[PDB]
């Protein structure tokens, strides 16, 4: 079957869109080359629709069957429950797309009468009707990147396909508890979304170290959501149904599968029939969990088909890393081709073909890699980092155009030990917050595909809790890492790090003069900038934070919201 069919109706915006970075003193202080930063818009939606539309065939074999059998047995050890209406409501992000039935995210979160009665009505209809396709909206995502001339200039907008708010609340009631238990049960340590960055580093290091002669690769599936077949999606349902669930959840999950997950009609923002989907919906609760599980079953089976020896996998949705025992240079090349062929057969053909990698730092999980620096007592400390280009581009954009859900704060939190966050991101944003006088204000941000809310004045405590005190003391970064950062700064026309260091010293002084939590941010976040360093002690507030499942609660999962757990 074709992943999509189309009416010819346009994919339309709802609010005005901009594709060019506006030139402005605040953002220009971060980077001058504004013409290199673009935002994807509905203008390129049709380009993307062409790419994501293709035929799927799928031939499964005994290797696939055997893995799936193991997964279902592992799933049977899970007991999960319905979430109450109230719990499901509280998981809705503040700016979640409003319902067509006269209420929005605000009414959901406050348990308003109209919202609650409509949600009860949608749930009951799920219980009574397991057949009628549920309508979805298709929208072009507005995301910011830097131009890459080597790779064809500009990326077209990604497409998001989602049901009405009322349905989204119901998905949580039926399936959220599953997202919290099931992936760990079926793939254990291979499940990436359970890990803070430091835990991801620790897992990758252990995976690499346990091999006598390690070889790793990343598998990039060409448009993963589109390769997911109706059978794949019903197979996911059989995996959900293998858990001990109450009857009512079984009914609702089956309806949601047949009415929403397997496919359905797509409408534009003007309510015109746009097309029909027969693949993964990119904007449902199960997108991430479904992709992770299905990517795992296909990948593990493909390893067996290929003769990959002792595979240790890190799976985050469609992002797959495989670390294994090297069978020799030409053997590894051969085995990866066999892996690709098996993946292709399973309906997951490659975008870029996988390449055998023999250096840990080249292994990228969700664009991220392990690097090393020195901590305060000369110990080597490994930490997660990434190319700063995209984080910097979005930072500039979010400086001049305020985003209701930003990316910069997520980057600071995820990548706190990195030199680019510490010298550029922290410096720039704390300066900006003082200019706007909005330091003491909770902000919403995206991290691992879900929504969180943090007050920037709490960053010292949050960073200590996730990354340790050493995140404020890291030094002697690797040449590969420094070369990459410096090169990004030159590409974007950003000030060099020596300018960031002068700027930081002034930002640090101004924060300290404010006293309170602001002074704590000065002292801890900017201790790298001063000649005479302070001795930073563990913050009492860091012990009081429970962030221990902060990542797993996100479920990689989109329409999910969490504040800081103190």
Entry resolution in angstroms? 2.2
Q: Quick check: 481 and 385 in contact, CB under 8 A? A: yes
In whole angstroms, give the CA distance from residue 252 to residue 110: 24
Tokens of 427: 């410096």
Tokens of 86: 């109230």
In whole angstroms, give the CA distance from residue 406 to residue 450: 11
Known binding-site residue numbers for Mg(2+)? 220, 318-319
Our separate counts of H helices and E strands in the chain read 22, 16
**Which residues, other chains included, contact 420 with Cβ-Cβ below 8 Å and sequence gap of 6+?**
385, 388, 391, 392, 485, 488
**Residue 359 phi, psi dihedral angles, 5° rounding:** -125, 125
278, 177, 554, 222 alpha-carbon torsion, rounded to 10° = -20
Tokens of 222: 């060409």
Q: Quick check: 281 and 161 in contact, CB under 8 A? A: yes
Known binding-site residue numbers? 220, 318-319
Mapped onto helix, strand or coil, the DSSP state of residue 340 is helix
Element holding 321 (H helix, E strand) = strand 319-325
Domain limits of the chain?
1-367, 368-566
**Residue 196 phi, psi dihedral angles, 5° rounding:** -70, 165
The torsion region of residue 316 among left (phi > 0), alpha (psi -120 to 50) and beta comes to: beta
In whole angstroms, give the CA distance from residue 64 to residue 207: 24
Give the residue carrying structure tokens 């962030």: 547
Give the residue carrying structure tokens 């409509």: 118
Q: Residue 493 to residues 37, 275, 504: CA-CA distances in angstroms?
A: 11, 42, 19
Question: Which has the closest alpha carbon to 68: 318, 237, 278?
Answer: 237
Give the strands of the sheet with 319-325, arranged side by side. Answer: 214-219, 319-325, 309-316
Element holding 238 (H helix, E strand) = helix 230-241
**Residue 537 phi, psi dihedral angles, 5° rounding:** -105, 155
Question: Which has the closest alpha carbon to 422: 370, 379, 383?
Answer: 383
**Residue 358 phi, psi dihedral angles, 5° rounding:** -120, 10
Rounded to 5 degrees, what angle do the CA atoms 61, 66, 67 make?
105
Q: Find how far residue 143's CA is from the centre of its chain.
A: 13
Alpha helices in 31-164 (DSSP H): 45-52, 62-75, 85-90, 105-109, 113-128
Please give the method by which this entry was determined.
X-ray
**Which residues, other chains included, contact 15 with Cβ-Cβ below 8 Å and sequence gap of 6+?**
none
């Amino acid at each position: 079957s074709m992943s999509y069919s189309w009416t010819g109706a346009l994919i339309t915006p709802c609010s005005p869109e901009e594709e060019k970075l506006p030139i402005n003193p605040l953002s220009n202080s971060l980077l001058r080359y504004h013409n290199k930063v673009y935002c994807t818009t509905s203008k390129s939606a049709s380009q993307r629709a062409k790419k994501v539309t293709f035929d799927r065939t799928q031939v499964l074999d005994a290797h696939y069957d055997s893995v799936l059998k193991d997964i279902k047995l592992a799933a049977s050890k899970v007991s999960a429950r319905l979430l109450t209406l109230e719990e499901a409501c509280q998981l809705t992000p503040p700016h979640s797309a409003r319902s067509k039935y006269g209420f929005g995210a605000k009414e959901v979160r406050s348990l308003s009468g109209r919202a609650v009665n409509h949600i009860k009505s949608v749930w009951k209809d799920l219980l009574e009707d397991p057949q009628t396709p549920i309508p979805t909206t298709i929208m072009a995502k507005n995301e910011v990147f830097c131009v890459d001339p080597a790779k064809g200039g500009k990326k077209p907008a990604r497409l998001i396909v989602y049901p009405d708010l009322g349905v989204r609340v119901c998905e949580k009631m039926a399936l959220y508890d599953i997202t919290q238990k099931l992936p760990q049960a079926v793939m254990g340590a291979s499940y990436g979304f359970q890990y803070s960055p430091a835990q991801r580093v620790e897992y990758l290091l252990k995976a690499w170290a346990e091999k006598k002669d390690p070889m790793g690769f990343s598998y990039d599936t060409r448009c993963f959501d589109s390769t997911v077949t109706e059978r794949d999606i019903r197979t996911e349902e059989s995996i959900y149904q293998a858990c001990s669930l109450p009857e009512e959840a079984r009914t609702a999950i089956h309806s949601l599968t047949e009415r929403l997950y397997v496919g359905g009609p797509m409408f534009n923002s003007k309510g015109q029939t746009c097309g029909y989907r027969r693949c993964r919906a990119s904007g449902v609760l199960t997108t991430s969990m479904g992709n992770t599980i299905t990517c795992y079953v296909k990948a593990l089976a493909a390893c067996k088909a290929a003769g990959i020896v002792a595979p240790t996998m890190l799976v985050c949705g469609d992002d797959l890393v495989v670390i294994s025992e090297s069978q020799g240079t030409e053997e590894d090349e051969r085995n990866l081709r066999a892996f690709t062929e098996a993946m292709t057969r399973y309906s997951a053909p490659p975008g870029d073909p996988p390449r055998p990698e023999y250096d840990l730092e080249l292994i990228t999980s969700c664009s991220s890699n392990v690097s090393v620096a020195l901590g305060p007592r000369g110990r080597r400390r490994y930490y997660l980092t990434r190319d700063p280009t995209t984080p910097l581009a979005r930072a500039a954009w979010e400086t001049v155009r305020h985003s209701p859900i930003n990316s910069w704060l997520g980057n600071i939190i995820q990548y706190a030990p990195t030199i680019w966050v510490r010298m550029v991101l922290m410096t720039h944003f704390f300066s900006i917050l003082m200019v706007q006088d909005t330091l003491d204000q909770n902000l919403n941000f995206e991290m691992y595909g879900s929504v969180y809310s943090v007050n920037p004045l709490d960053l010292p405590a949050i960073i200590e809790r996730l990354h340790g005190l050493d995140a404020f003391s890291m030094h002697t970064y690797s040449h590969h890492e420094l070369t990459r950062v410096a090169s990004a700064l030159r590409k974007l026309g950003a000030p060099p790090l020596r300018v960031w260091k002068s700027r930081a010293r002034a930002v640090r002084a101004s924060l300290i003069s404010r006293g309170g939590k602001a002074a704590v941010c000065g002292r801890y976040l900017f201790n790298w900038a001063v000649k005479t360093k302070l001795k930073l002690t563990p913050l009492p507030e860091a012990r009081l934070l429970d962030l221990s499942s902060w990542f797993t609660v996100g479920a990689g999962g989109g329409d999910i919201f969490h504040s800081v757990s103190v």
